[PDB]
Amino acid sequence: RTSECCFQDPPYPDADSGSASGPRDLRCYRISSDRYECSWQYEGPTAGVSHFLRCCLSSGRCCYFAAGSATRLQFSDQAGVSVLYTVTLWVESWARNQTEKSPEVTLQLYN
Amino acid sequence: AIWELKKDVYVVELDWYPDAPGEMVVLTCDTPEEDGITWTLDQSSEVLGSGKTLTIQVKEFGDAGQYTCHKGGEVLSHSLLLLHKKEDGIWSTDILKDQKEPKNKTFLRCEAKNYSGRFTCWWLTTISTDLTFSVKSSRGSSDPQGVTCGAATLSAERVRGDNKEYEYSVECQEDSACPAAEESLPIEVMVDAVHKLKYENYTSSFFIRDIIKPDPPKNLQLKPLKNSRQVEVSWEYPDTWSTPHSYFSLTFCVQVQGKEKKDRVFTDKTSATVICRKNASISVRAQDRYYSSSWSEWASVPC
Amino acid sequence: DIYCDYLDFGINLTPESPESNFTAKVTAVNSLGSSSSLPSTFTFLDIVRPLPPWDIRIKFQKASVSRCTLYWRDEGLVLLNRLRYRPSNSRLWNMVNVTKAKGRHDLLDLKPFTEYEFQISSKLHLYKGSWSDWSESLRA
Amino acid sequence: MFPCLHHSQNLLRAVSNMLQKARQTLEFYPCTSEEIDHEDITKDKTSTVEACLPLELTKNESCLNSRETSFITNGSCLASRKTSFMMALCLSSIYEDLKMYQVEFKTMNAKLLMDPKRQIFLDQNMLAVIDELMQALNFNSETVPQKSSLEEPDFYKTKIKLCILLHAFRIRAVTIDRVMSYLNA
Ligand SMILES: *[C@@H]1O[C@H](CO)[C@@H](O[C@@H]2O[C@H](CO)[C@@H](O[C@@H]3O[C@H](CO)[C@@H](O)[C@H](O)[C@@H]3O)[C@H](O)[C@H]2NC(C)=O)[C@H](O)[C@H]1NC(C)=O
Ligand SMILES: *[C@@H]1O[C@H](CO)[C@@H](O)[C@H](O)[C@H]1NC(C)=O
Numbered sequence: 001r002t003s004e005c006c007f008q009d010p011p012y013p014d015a016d017s018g019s020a021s022g023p024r025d026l027r028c029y030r031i032s033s034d035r036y037e038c039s040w041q042y043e044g045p046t047a048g049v050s051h052f053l054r055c056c057l058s059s060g061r062c063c064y065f066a067a068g069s070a071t072r073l074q075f076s077d078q079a080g081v082s083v084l085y086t087v088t089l090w091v092e093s094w095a096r097n098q099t100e101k102s103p104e105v106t107l108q109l110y111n
Numbered sequence: 112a113i114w115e116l117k118k119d120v121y122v123v124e125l126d127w128y129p130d131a132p133g134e135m136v137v138l139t140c141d142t143p144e145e146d147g148i149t150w151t152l153d154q155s156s157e158v159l160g161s162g163k164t165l166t167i168q169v170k171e172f173g174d175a176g177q178y179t180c181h182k183g184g185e186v187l188s189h190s191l192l193l194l195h196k197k198e199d200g201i202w203s204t205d206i207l208k209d210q211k212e213p214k215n216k217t218f219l220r221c222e223a224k225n226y227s228g229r230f231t232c233w234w235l236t237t238i239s240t241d242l243t244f245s246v247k248s249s250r251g252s253s254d255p256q257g258v259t260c261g262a263a264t265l266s267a268e269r270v271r272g273d274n275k276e277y278e279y280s281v282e283c284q285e286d287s288a289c290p291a292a293e294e295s296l297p298i299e300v301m302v303d304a305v306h307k308l309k310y311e312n313y314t315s316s317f318f319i320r321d322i323i324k325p326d327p328p329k330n331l332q333l334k335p336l337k338n339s340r341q342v343e344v345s346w347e348y349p350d351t352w353s354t355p356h357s358y359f360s361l362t363f364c365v366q367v368q369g370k371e372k373k374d375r376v377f378t379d380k381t382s383a384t385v386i387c388r389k390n391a392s393i394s395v396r397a398q399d400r401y402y403s404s405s406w407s408e409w410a411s412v413p414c
Numbered sequence: 415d416i417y418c419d420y421l422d423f424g425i426n427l428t429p430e431s432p433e434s435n436f437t438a439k440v441t442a443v444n445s446l447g448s449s450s451s452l453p454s455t456f457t458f459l460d461i462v463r464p465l466p467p468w469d470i471r472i473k474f475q476k477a478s479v480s481r482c483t484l485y486w487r488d489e490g491l492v493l494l495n496r497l498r499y500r501p502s503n504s505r506l507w508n509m510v511n512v513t514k515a516k517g518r519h520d521l522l523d524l525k526p527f528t529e530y531e532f533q534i535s536s537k538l539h540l541y542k543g544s545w546s547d548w549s550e551s552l553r554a
Numbered sequence: 555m556f557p558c559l560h561h562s563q564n565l566l567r568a569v570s571n572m573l574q575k576a577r578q579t580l581e582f583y584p585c586t587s588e589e590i591d592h593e594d595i596t597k598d599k600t601s602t603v604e605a606c607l608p609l610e611l612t613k614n615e616s617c618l619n620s621r622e623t624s625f626i627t628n629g630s631c632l633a634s635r636k637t638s639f640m641m642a643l644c645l646s647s648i649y650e651d652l653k654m655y656q657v658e659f660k661t662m663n664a665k666l667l668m669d670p671k672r673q674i675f676l677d678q679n680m681l682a683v684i685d686e687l688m689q690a691l692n693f694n695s696e697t698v699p700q701k702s703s704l705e706e707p708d709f710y711k712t713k714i715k716l717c718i719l720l721h722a723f724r725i726r727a728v729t730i731d732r733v734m735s736y737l738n739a
Binding site for chain 2: 034077080082086110
Binding site: 288289290291292293295354355357358359360401402 | 606
């Protein structure tokens with residue numbers, strides 16, 4: 001749970017799409033052999049906006065990372081995300097009590 | 112391949128390329144035979160397999176961890192799994208960081224201050240927590256229990272960039288009773304870095320004379336000659352340095368630049384005379400006279 | 415030379431008779447003044463000092479017996495001698511005098527074969543001769 | 555001042571200059587300390603590694619193996635009644651080390667001269683210093699006979715062997731210098 005993915009379902013009760021304003025341009029790149037970074041841009045600004053990176057492995061055990069008002073996260077081979085096999089990644093933000101979802105992207109993540 | 116680093120710990124070597132099949136891994140328990148042994152990986156009661164034998168290819172890091180041998184409600188044995196990633200056929204090196212000061216691919220830097228054989232090795236790693244190091248040493252391979260390496264200890268927490276590299280060092284003493292004039296075999300030090308489920312190993316070979324770094328000259332004092340501009344300066348050999356001081360000798364370099372570019376003078380003698388400008392400091396350095404060695408820290412006395 | 419540790423007479427002194435009187439004086443002279451040492455009279459025996467015995471041999475009386483025979487060699491004119499029979503681990507006592515024999519015979523030695531240090535000295539004259547320096551220690 | 559110490563200091567300096575020349579002459583041949591393995595010809599023949607130590611350092615005497623090669627050759631460097639056996643055995647072993655190296659160096663030099671060009675050849679001054687030191691170390695000094703061959707050897711092998719010997723000899727020269735300094739003081 002500490003700077004590592006949590007397999008348990010995210011705390012917010014409803015993931016229903018909230019509004020026209022959505023996080024966009026989710027992209028993941030390999031900074032180093034064991035360092036990685038994913039960048040997402042939120043279209044609508046908020047003082048209390050909270051950003052969450054929720055991914056799903058090939059097994060289907062979707063897990064959610066915890067982040068606090070950041071467009072970027074950096075994780076290592078053992079965060080929980082597979083860095084050799086296919087792995088989807090998507091971003092959800094609870095701002096205004098509505099959770100908007102960045103379009104899901106599947107990347108090898110080894111590049 | 113699968114090999115045991117220590118009892119109940121098994122390091123598995125895996126190639127690192129996308130969509131890679133895993134090595135067939137077999138788990139066995141050295142316990143009185145029980146019909147119905149169950150097996151868990153996570154702390155959760157999800158049960159992975161039944162029987163005294165569990166088969167599970169370690170295709171990814173998630174599949175490596177403490178498999179637990181438990182039956183009857185009692186944990187019969189334990190099966191921790193460690194992973195040694197190999198990328199393009201080359202062993203991974205992620206836990207420690209390449210200093211590069213001597214040359215590329217240098218992760219271990221060792222030093223000594225005496226011919227006694229006491230030496231210390233410093234390795235810089237940027238991983239803050241969940242880090243353990245195993246250190247073993249020997250003269251060549253012939254000496255069994257040749258060197259008695261101590262245990263790794265965190266030493267410093269500097270802030271290079273924002274990474275905050277942490278420096279860990281070991282204290283090792285050549286335990287050979289027989290004294291010998293010259294060394295024919297290089298001392299070899301191996302650090303078995305372990306982080307979480309990832310295992311790495313680093314090997315360094317060196318000679319004590321090459322890594323020797325003298326401590327600063329002791330009892331430096333300035334004595335002005337009567338009615339002369341020059342000032343005689345006298346220094347003494349460090350107590351820590353090996354004895355006798357005749358067989359093992361040092362060369363002193365004296366620089367008077369203080370605060371013209373290079374006033375350095377190399378004197379074997381323990382006393383040299385240098386004109387002292389009122390606005391400068393006089394500093395002395397020590398190196399092994401016989402062979403090229405790392406220079407000592409400057410010893411400065413105000414002038 | 416302004417500083418002299420000692421001055422050596424190249425010619426060796428052969429004494430017409432063992433009891434003779436030879437007197438030595440030293441004079442120091444400088445621009446300001448002159449000081450002369452009091453005359454000191456020395457007999458030849460006082461001046462001569464025997465050399466430490468150069469040779470040493472250990473034999474257990476040609477047997478495994480405790481008794482030991484020591485075959486050393488030194489300057490011919492020696493009328494006395496002394497030997498160290500002290501145990502090597504702890505020094506005890508050394509005999510004050512040995513007979514006028516280059517080769518020791520029937521010396522009392524410890525039954526064990528443990529290493530023992532051996533030192534030897536000779537006296538040119540008992541009445542007025544200095545003792546020689548102890549010879550290099552012989553191990554076992 | 556010790557005359558043998560002066561010869562040993564001359565030896566270390568002569569090897570240092572020859573080693574620098576060897577690195578400059580053989581640019582391609584690898585002659586850096588990092589790329590050249592340490593191999594000592596006198597590994598088992600002589601006991602300089604054990605016998606030549608300060609008296610304080612050597613105590614158990616068990617490690618001196620059965621008075622190995624205990625020739626104890628008498629010589630002009632020390633006096634017969636002056637120093638302990640530990641230094642007498644050491645001086646004999648040092649004489650033997652210089653004899654093993656000089657015989658080999660002369661063999662290499664004789665092969666090097668045949669080269670059509672003169673890329674490198676052993677320093678005559680360095681060889682002379684080794685002989686002078688041996689004469690002081692042991693009265694029964696044997697002068698190596700002029701060596702020659704009736705055929706031409708491969709030169710690359712001689713030039714790699716040369717670099718391996720020079721570096722090992724330099725370490726031996728410092729060891730002799732340390733012993734000579736201890737004898738003087
Ligand atoms: C440094 O890390 C490597 C990576 O594992 C170690 O190489 C591996 O060493 C083990 C231990 O010897 C080998 O496992 C066993 O080897 C023996 C002897 O060949 C054999 O009888 C066993 O059946 C098993 O194979 C393993 O094969 C070997 N890996 C490779 C690729 O050769 C190395 O030992 C480590 N060094 C240190 C000092 O920790
Ligand atoms: C030497 O002098 C002492 C005292 O002055 C005297 O007893 C002795 O007989 C003298 N010796 C000779 C040979 O005159």
